[PDB]
């Protein structure tokens, strides 16, 4: 699906996918965003659909 996410710390906007394979680094800083995990990649960002 399409998902607009906003970095909580960075405060910047990025477009990440729902339930991704890999670790998501923010281009705003190289801090994590959504995580890989034990299956069902989740998040730690907030916003809505793009």
């Amino acid at each position: 699906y399409f998902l607009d996410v906003k970095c909580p710390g960075c405060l910047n906007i990025t477009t990440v996918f729902s339930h991704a394979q890999t670790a998501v680094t923010c281009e705003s800083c190289s801090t994590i965003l959504c995580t890989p995990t034990g299956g069902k990649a989740k998040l730690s960002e907030g916003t809505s659909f793009r």
Binding site: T15, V16, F17, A20, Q21, T22, R50
Partner: peptide
């Protein structure tokens, strides 16, 4: 090939 592809900016 599969990995690269899960980065980004998937859209």
């Amino acid at each position: 090939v599969t990995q690269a592809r899960v980065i980004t900016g998937n859209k």
